């Protein structure tokens, strides 16, 4: 069939540069031509516009003139899209796709399933830097719980970027976890919960400790959650 | 110049459904219409090409409708996998550019409602002697995935310092979310008490701290 891979995911600051690649196999690279498409976080779909695959010559949607540009490397069978200034706004996920056959069996194209779009690249723009989080305890508390249980937590507070790791106990404690997505605040820094329910006879007799882990600032974090 | 379409639609398993596409007479009548689902962390998929025509792999329960100024996507026999994205899409012969729908969000309600479970932690004591207070309010065990959150200051609103995250599919199917109050430890114990307000369903949940 018709493949396209892209590549994997980006972080930039605004003002940057990115190249994001979009290689296609198992067809005649000239047969179908290359469309852009990018999608905003909880947003629709913007055609950015089209490269011609035998010619080389691109079609940019208006607005994108100029801090866009499509490139191709035929021999590799390879479509670029280069995008310069970043701005936050062009956060987002980044397809490449077929595009129908501007004469010759159209129909075809359509039938056999020769229309596909490549998994996306997702493009992340950020002002932060790398930060570890400030994990904070979340003191139990029996009123939102079950009978003889006590919910507590650990705040996992302003780190950059995704992802962390939460675990209770050394791995020892998995029954009743619940770890929440992340927000992203206004500062471009994420925060993220992880609550557990226990037995309210375990308190001050069982100890809790959440262990946290941020690869990318190279932060581990156990946090004790005492009773107050 | 623009493919309208309504934001969401929605329906119970077996039921039938009807998305809108609205147009012109220089992008719609006269160029062909397509049809796109795009399902949670995936690319779109075409379901139907050239108005109404169903390419290899589509179910018969979708299909496609065209007017002279307006398009429809009709679902028969409608299942929890439906749940997605759709979008209309044709060419603009004048500007020589695709244009796309703004998409319509479709919900299946595949299970009963369920409430939501609210547990609402006050800063912590280490927070406050870093000179920050942020108040926790998670919201869990909830159906359909969707969710309003409000904070207050003793009796009043707060808009300043709230960040509420979009629902999330938890492992039992029900969905999840979080909101955050950014305070300062002056604000924190100046107030009487702090609340978060969750309504889902006509149903509200509020439950209060206080320093």
């Known amino acids: 069939q018709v493949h396209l891979v892209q590549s994997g995911s980006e972080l930039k600051k605004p003002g940057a540069s990115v190249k994001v690649s979009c290689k296609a196999s198992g067809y005649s690279f000239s047969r179908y031509g290359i469309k852009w498409v990018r999608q905003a976080p909880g947003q629709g779909l913007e055609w950015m516009g089209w490269?011609?695959?035998?010619?080389?010559?691109?079609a940019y949607a208006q607005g994108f003139t100029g801090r866009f540009v499509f490139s191709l490397d035929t021999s590799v069978d390879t479509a670029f899209l280069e995008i310069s200034s970043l701005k936050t706004e062009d956060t987002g996920i980044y397809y490449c796709?077929?595009?129908?056959?501007?004469?010759?069996?159209?129909?075809?194209?359509?039938?056999?399933?020769?229309?596909?779009w490549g998994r996306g690249t997702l493009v992340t723009v950020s002002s932060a830097s790398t930060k570890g989080p400030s994990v904070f305890p979340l003191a139990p508390s029996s009123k939102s719980t079950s009978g003889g249980t006590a919910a507590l937590g650990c705040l996992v507070k302003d780190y950059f970027p995704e992802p962390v790791t939460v675990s209770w106990n050394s791995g020892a404690l998995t029954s009743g976890v619940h770890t929440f997505p992340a927000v992203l605040q206004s500062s471009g820094l994420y925060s993220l919960s992880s609550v557990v329910t226990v037995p309210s006879s375990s308190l001050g007799t069982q100890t809790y400790i959440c262990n946290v882990n941020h690869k990318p600032s190279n932060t581990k974090v156990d946090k004790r959650v005492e009773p107050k | 110049s623009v493919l309208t379409q309504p934001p969401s639609a929605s329906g119970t398993p077996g039921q039938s459904v009807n998305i809108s596409c609205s147009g012109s007479?220089?992008?719609?009548?006269?160029?062909?219409v397509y049809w796109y689902q795009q399902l949670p962390g995936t690319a779109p998929k075409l379901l139907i090409y050239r108005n109404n025509r169903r390419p290899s792999g589509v179910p018969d329960r979708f299909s496609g409708s065209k007017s002279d100024t307006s398009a429809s996507l009709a679902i028969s026999g409608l299942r929890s996998e439906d749940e997605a994205d759709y979008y209309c899409?044709?060419?603009?012969?004048?500007?020589?550019?695709?244009?796309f729908g703004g998409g319509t969000k479709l919900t299946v309600l595949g299970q009963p409602k369920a409430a939501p479970s609210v547990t609402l932690f006050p800063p912590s004591s280490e927070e406050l002697q870093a000179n920050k207070a942020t108040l926790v309010c998670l919201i869990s065990d909830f159906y359909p995935g969707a969710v309003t959150v409000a904070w207050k200051a003793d009796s009043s609103p707060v808009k300043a310092g709230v960040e509420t995250t979009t629902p999330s599919k938890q492992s039992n199917n029900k969905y999840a979310a979080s909101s955050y109050l950014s305070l300062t430890p002056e604000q924190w114990k100046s107030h009487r008490s702090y609340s978060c307000q969750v309504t889902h369903e006509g149903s509200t949940v509020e439950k209060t701290v206080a320093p």
């Open positions: 007479s220089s992008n719609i009548g006269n160029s062909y």
């Open positions: 899409a044709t060419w603009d012969d004048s500007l020589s550019g695709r244009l």
């Open positions: 490269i011609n695959t035998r010619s080389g010559v691109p």
């Open positions: 796709a077929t595009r129908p056959p501007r004469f010759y069996d159209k129909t075809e194209y359509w039938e056999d399933g020769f229309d596909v």
